[PDB]
Design a protein around this ligand. Sequence first.
Ligand SMILES: NCc1c[nH]c2nc(N)[nH]c(=O)c12
Ligand SMILES: [Mg+2]
Lengths: 99, 79, 1337
Amino acid sequence: MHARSTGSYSLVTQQPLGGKAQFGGQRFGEMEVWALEAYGAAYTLQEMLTVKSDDVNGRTKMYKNIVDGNHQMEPGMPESFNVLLKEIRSLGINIELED
Amino acid sequence: ARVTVQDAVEKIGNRFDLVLVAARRARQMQVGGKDPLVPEENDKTTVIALREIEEGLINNQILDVRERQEQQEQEAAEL
Amino acid sequence: EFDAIKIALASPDMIRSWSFGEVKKPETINYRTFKPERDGLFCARIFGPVKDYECLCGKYKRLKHRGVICEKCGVEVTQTKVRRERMGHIELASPTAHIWFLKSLPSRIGLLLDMPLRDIERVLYFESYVVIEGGMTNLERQQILTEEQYLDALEEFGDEFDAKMGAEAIQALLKSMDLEQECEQLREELNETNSETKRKKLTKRIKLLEAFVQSGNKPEWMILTVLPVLPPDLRPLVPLDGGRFATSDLNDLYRRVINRNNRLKRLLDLAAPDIIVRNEKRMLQEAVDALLDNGRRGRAITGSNKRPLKSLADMIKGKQGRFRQNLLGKRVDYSGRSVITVGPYLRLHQCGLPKKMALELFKPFIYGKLELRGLATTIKAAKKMVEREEAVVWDILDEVIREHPVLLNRAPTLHRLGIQAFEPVLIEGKAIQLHPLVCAAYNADFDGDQMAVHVPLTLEAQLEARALMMSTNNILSPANGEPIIVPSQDVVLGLYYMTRDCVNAKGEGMVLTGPKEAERLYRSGLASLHARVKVRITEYEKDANGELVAKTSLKDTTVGRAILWMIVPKGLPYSIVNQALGKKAISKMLNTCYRILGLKPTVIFADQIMYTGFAYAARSGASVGIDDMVIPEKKHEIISEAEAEVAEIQEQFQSGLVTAGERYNKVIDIWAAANDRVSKAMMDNLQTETVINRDGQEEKQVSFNSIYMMADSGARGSAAQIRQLAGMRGLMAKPDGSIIETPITANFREGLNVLQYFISTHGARKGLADTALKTANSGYLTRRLVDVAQDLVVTEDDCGTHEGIMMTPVIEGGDVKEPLRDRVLGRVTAEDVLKPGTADILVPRNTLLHEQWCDLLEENSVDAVKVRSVVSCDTDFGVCAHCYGRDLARGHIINKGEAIGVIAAQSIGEPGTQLTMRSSIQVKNKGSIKLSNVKSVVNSSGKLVITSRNTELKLIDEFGRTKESYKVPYGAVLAKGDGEQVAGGETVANWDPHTMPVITEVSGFVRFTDMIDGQTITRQTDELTGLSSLVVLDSAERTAGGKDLRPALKIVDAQGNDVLIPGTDMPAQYFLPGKAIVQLEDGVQISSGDTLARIPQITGGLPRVADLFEARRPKEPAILAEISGIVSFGKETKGKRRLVITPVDGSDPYEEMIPKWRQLNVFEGERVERGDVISDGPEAPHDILRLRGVHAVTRYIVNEVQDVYRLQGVKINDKHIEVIVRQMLRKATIVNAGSSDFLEGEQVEYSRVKIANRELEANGKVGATYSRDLLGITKASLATESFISAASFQETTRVLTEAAVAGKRDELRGLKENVIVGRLIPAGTGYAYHQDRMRRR
DNA sequence: CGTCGAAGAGATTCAGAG
DNA sequence: CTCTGAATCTCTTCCTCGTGTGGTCAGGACG
RNA sequence: GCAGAGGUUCUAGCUACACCCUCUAUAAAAAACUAAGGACCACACGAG
Ligand SMILES: NCc1c[nH]c2nc(N)[nH]c(=O)c12
Ligand SMILES: [Mg+2]
């Protein structure tokens, strides 16, 4: 038994940090995303991917929303994507986002 | 408490429209101060919406009409 | 919020625009002082402050000082998160070429200059001059020069021009050339080109040039001059570990690059000799190459411990890169893990949960509820009381747990049902309980398996895990309509033991009032559980529409069956709980209950059946004892007689009568026969041998042996395993795939010898080693299938099209494998299916076919029904609802939006775990023989003789359904005639398989056309027939003189005239194939059916499915007829046989080269049709698609996959195969450009070209013609619409380079490009929101 | 006191005859 | 002689979750 | 922190997303508000 709710995060801000002696969340692996996509469930997928895992302005917002009484969501955008953008931008390849 | 939701999805055929039309009803019961029309009994605010939909008291049109009436009432106070 | 992303090659000015500072000092930090160095790789001034709102000198420490750069330390005070966003750049002293744009497969820097890769490799590494600005010389601008040759050129040419060196030379060459200039001359050269290979190379180059000139790129940009550095916090860094700060990361590479650059700068300002500057520049280039991608060269730069240190390109691609480790599979909070427990009591909509786990999962909810109660003033007090674990906290926890579903997720979730929802029920202990009936969809044992518990937080997630994911919502699996909650092990055995009959048990022949009284008469012990009695039952009927009709008849059954009646709902009839009730009967009972009663009265029934099964399997005491496994008495005699037979064969071999191989085969066959005999003896002594009294003499009755009851009921084990428990084990296989001569003659109840165990261990080792490869290959196949479809969503409700693929029952010659009532059910017809009475429309053209329709189809007995399928749908970016048919999960038409792209990929890749990795034909039943498209000729014996091989033997009864199909050889002799009723048991076709008959279409004399005895046919003396038999010399064996002539037979009359084929002027010419043994002579009449020449004569594993989907060309592809015409030859196999086919209407430019060793089943007098086979052999998917349309490749690539999947017994509905087929042939090629702007040679997506030509035809101008194309899954996925959709699947470097060079912007719109970004996926409930947002634009 | 194997596609190689 | 196909060389990928132990730079003076 | 300053406590507690209170030169009367630094590699183990 290991279950955790909140705790320390990693450098890439993927919060669970790996289930072990140190606190960790079980990996919502690659196949589980497909298993979610097979159903019509997308909101739970979004909350598995953004608010729960890595969104610095999502975690600290919903930890206050839940204790307040309303179960809302704000997606933000994962820090891992802001890491991939840097790891490609530092390669001599300019990758950006339109608007 | 409801275990099988097949009765509800007959009212809202998509069953993807059912979740989106019940989330608004649940929000109007958690954040918004409105009271459920179904007699509440110990149940949380997320199955009360499904219970209302089962009775046919709520669909994708009734809640829109109600929010339009709320908008009109707010317009009345604006003078 | 923001539109799609775009990717383009980074300009040297843009890098300067990005960076905030400039790094000049290699050292990251001072070891003595924690604060970073001013010019170091970690820098406070460049990459922001180290701590929040704090400078380095400590002058300012509060928010009121924010935004003011301190002048003492020099760091602009701001938050710390700016340390993951700012960037820095190094100024290289010598221009350095990118490695991604040099060592990649097409090598764009080489394709852009049209020079070999090796020359660029040489000049880039400072060992060979390349001429720049040759001028009026004998040295070209693309010329490669050698050091000594360069010196000689200097001595020879006095003009000031000189070949440069290094990456600067390549940069200057790139700058000098004009991209727009070469395009016109390349187009002219392509037009003047006489060959297609050179023109193809030219098309590649011109496409690269056009891509460069369209997007905003400058070729000079491939050689970076300023190089950016990653932000400091992006470096993994080292945690305080006692004062080491040690780990292998990028910082080593960045330090070495900076050191090399600084040395180069110092040497350049020191006026060093060229021999040293060149070496320094080469070292700098090697360092930059290693930094960008460590290992693209032969040498892999490695730090300490001799391990290849990671580089930037190694942290994007692969299972360790971001795209598959940190973007797709993010680890989540609010999780948990524990071992499994039976959890029998909880209903199938709820599962157990330890208190010590549910307390930690729902912590914020507990805090909120405590705040609402007023127990805790602040969050601190709430945390304290939660850690106290006092009485109030548990009461609060029993509130937030009431109606809050949780997701019980199994570890290897192969298919959709892997992760389901449950309602928690708090229990003590430390294990997660689980309803037993759902321990099958999970494929979850109880030998210490581990499930993970997730939690939905938002209100939408709670409602979704209730309306889609609750275990009571997915009863039927998406792969097939059959239920997935079939009772598995103990409940089925209990029901089987309940529903039986012993011919004499207490309470026999009595009359019972009803089940209410039967349960009492059994509980009292006055009557045994099995006893044939007479009871009355209120059988309720739904025959009246929407009404329940109650009929009560005194039915005869057992007490046990009568007790079971009360559990079943009222609607079901009584003809289901009356039989023996094995396992398949129970599953069918559940299916019928769901079909005719809905879902709500089936969940209750399936929950109640488990209780009854467990309760009456506990009272049974079904134990296994040694005396159960009876050894048949006949076994010893069978063993002795088999030993005698093998000894006889051994003595024969020692006498030389038989060969070693023949004796080995005989021994194997006799041992197999003996094994089957002993197995039959044991089975007959196991099931029937029970004998008891019927109040009189002895009577026979099916056994009550426990081992037999665990096999007949299907609870666990089959007859094959029992064969290993009582009878002999049989013959075992050697590790190399051979069968050992001596089988193991000992069972498991008996002792097993030492040798008979050392032999047995081979199979166990092989089977256990195959797990570690079956799973490893099934995973990859599933991943490819998922990432190839990945985007199919049912967006439109009706295509409105008309054409649909045909559907017919499939028979291999035995019993019908699949009736038309099985495949067709769940789909929608294309054209109006007609009653066998003509001009009668039984069912309209566009009605869905449910059970009440399939039942009607059975009455009329129709074999061919057109069905719309997703291959012929015309809706772009998504299949239709009607074109897809029944959802197969809920018995209604699929809703508008369900993500069907991933469902099929999961349902096909799921059975990849249990799937194994590796004369005279007698009729089955009486009926009439029908031969489709046959040309029968009556032989001398009077037996029916088919002309062509394509005719197939089929039997037709009064219903017209083909009971069987038989493949028959070309020109064979058949015992029975066509259109004649035949009896069962007797063979309709008899022939010698070794001999290949060669018959003629019509009767007449034989004339040896273009034939000379000794040139094309050399008469070989036959010692058996007593006459020298004309043997045709082989094409590669006969002389070249006879090669020019074509050995043929002509039909002629008695006078000498040539008899023409009926219909065609040219007389019939029969070419005698090589090594043909013709009994008749030149000038002897041929009987139509007599054999002129007597010529002596898949892998159901996973690789077959993989090769099928991959569209791999078979080893020996059978050639086909491109256009209908008459067969003709143009050469005499001068290196290769030549074939020319010309239509009678239009002249032909198409001539086919044929290998000389391929047999030609066609004759030059025969006229072929389009799509007709020329040479026999395996077919290629590529050939079929471009010869017989698109509808024909489906009927093959689905039939073959189903053939592979039928052997193992697994069932997968056809539409799941068909959507993968549709995703395969999505790319199309245009034959002629027409009025559209597409270049004729380019490949464009089928949807784009279809929409473009339709829009063009909306105006006067005509659209563009297109030719369909087929691509394998692993190549179609890599060439998808979006670059980021294929850059996370495979080959990241190539995909990213190709996207960056062309400036290929994205559009999202997929299911992975939205998962990566982290927004609503356009698959399920988010489809409405995405639709809306699209409407906004 | 900071400071200096397999296996398969694809792109090169390469070839053979009329 | 110049593609024609036919060898021949090069890059890629080869499941998915956990439970645990242990070991590990960089780069030692230097003024 | 009404702006500046100080602050009960329930680590630390004008930013981390923060937040509130009283007071007028400097700390002291009071309740309600949050959740932190952890890389790589070998060996063994379990399950599908
Ligand atoms: N730490 C001193 C103090 C006591 N109460 C407080 N309340 C708030 N909002 N912030 C604080 O800093 C304090
Ligand atoms: Mg297990």
